[PDB]
Every structure is written in structure tokens, then in C-alpha cells.
Chains A and B, each alone.
With several copies, the nearest count.
Chain A
């Protein structure tokens, strides 16, 4: 199977103050959200789908007895990719930095204000990796996004 949940709403997605800790609202443009509908290996897309599903379930459905495990059991495969967390678990097993879906990093254009799709931060020794140990990934992301904006 493959996830079929489409993110809500020009065309971007805005995370409220409740979805973040020690942070305010943050909006991402359509050029970054559109990647979340085609890629299969992005942590932030699955987490955005989970948050959107939670918000829609809260808004459009009632609440009683807190026995909502049925809904998430029914709709788990339509929001996230299980093999992605399987890959993260495998990378954890082999003694390689992995991601527990907590921290994310992205690139901001100071003037234009356009942002890249956030990539989740890496943890090794149960601690967050310093920026110096994945700088090449940041440069690659910047190069790819400059190439995208060039066309």
C-alpha cells in the first residue's frame, strides 16, 4: 500500500503554536509541501500527515472514553510509511546515526523567505549531532533547491 492522505490548507501548510515546543506558528510554501505528496522517504511528511489527521479527527469527530485506538489502527497505513521507521530502526541497530522524529532542520532564504522541506535531525550516542558532521548534506540540499528555483 501507499499513503493517500492529502495535507489541508496558498497550497502551503502552517504548523500552529500547539504543534511546536517553545516556538510560534511556522508556515511552509507550496513548493515544499508538493514534495510530500510524491516522496516516500521523508520523515516530516509523515509527521505532517499524522498531525493533520489528528486535527481533522478532533474537529470533525466526537470524543468519548478516549478509546481512539480503533481509528488510528484503521488509518495508520494511510498516513505513514512503516518501512521508513523500519529503516530508521535498522540504522539504529547497525550503530549509525538515526532519527527518532523529534528535531528537524531546514534552510531559510533571508530575503525571499522561501524554505526547503525540513530534514529530520540525526541522533548518535543518544545526543543530537553537531552541525559540522552533516554540513555536506546541508550544502547538497541548498544546491538542489537553488537548482530548483533556477528553473
Chain B
């Protein structure tokens, strides 16, 4: 399965929320993962499952959706939140990553 991200870029000023979308080719029941990658850094797991936060992740990030359609919402987007966000499905093999969208 191949999944794509709709915005592909986001020039958003700090202070307000940010919304990211992820569309899957086939059905992926709550088996999604959202990662963030800082410039020149290894990616880290932000959201595992559809709407479950990883340990040590601030409550600003929140996942939602199911089936084919998934969304990620950041309430108070700050300076440290400027990274590249990746959408991955792990419902079946091989594991597929999204094209990624840049939040600048």
C-alpha cells in the first residue's frame, strides 16, 4: 500500500494550530504512525497507533482518524515544532512511509 500526504508543505507562523492529512491506498485500521525529523537529526516516534501519544511527547500533538483517512493536529505550534513530519502504515508488509510535509 502507498499512502500520500495532501499539503506537502506548510508555511505557518508560530502561535496557531497546524493540521496535517494522510491518505491511505487501502484500509489501515488504527495502525498508523507519525514521526518528526528535525533538520540534520534522526526521526523520532511522535504518535504510535491512530490516536496514542508516545512516551515523553507533549500534549500539543494529537492524532485522529481511522480506516483510510488520518489527521495530525498541533495546538500550540512553537519554534521546536519546525521539522518534517512522516506518515507510516504498519498494518501490512512492506512498511510504507509517506512523502512527508515540511512545517516551516
Interface of A is mostly: helix
CA distance A59 to B27 in the complex (A): 9
CA distance A140 to B56 in the complex (A): 30
Which chain B residue lies CB-closest to A125? Answer: B93
A60 beta carbon closer than 8 Å to chain B: yes
Residues of A within 8 A of B (CB-CB), count: 3
Taking CB atoms, residues of chain B closer than 8 Å to A60 are 27, 29
Q: How large, as a class, is the contact surface on chain B?
A: under 10
CA distance A68 to B33 in the complex (A): 32
CA distance A59 to B67 in the complex (A): 7
Taking CB atoms, residues of chain B closer than 8 Å to A59 are 29-30, 66
Taking CB atoms, residues of chain B closer than 8 Å to A62 are 27
CA distance A62 to B26 in the complex (A): 11
CA distance A50 to B29 in the complex (A): 20
Which chain B residue lies CB-closest to A95? Answer: B92
Q: How does the 8 Å CB contact mask read for A105-118 relative to B, with 1 for contact and 0 for none?
A: 00000000000000
Q: What is the CB-to-nearest-CB distance from B25 to chain A, in angstroms, rounded to a whole number?
A: 14
CA distance A62 to B66 in the complex (A): 14
List which B23-74 residues lie within 8 A (CB) of chain A.
Answer: 27, 29-30, 66
Taking CB atoms, residues of chain A closer than 8 Å to B30 are 59
List which A49-100 residues lie within 8 A (CB) of chain B.
Answer: 59-60, 62
CA distance A59 to B28 in the complex (A): 9
Q: What is the CB-to-nearest-CB distance from A33 to chain B, in angstroms, rounded to a whole number?
A: 21
The chain A residues found within 8 Å of chain B, CB to CB, are 59-60, 62
The chain B residues found within 8 Å of chain A, CB to CB, are 27, 29-30, 66
Please provide the 6 A-B residue pairs with the shortest distance between their CB atoms, ordered closest to farther.
Answer: A59-B29, A60-B29, A60-B27, A62-B27, A59-B30, A59-B66
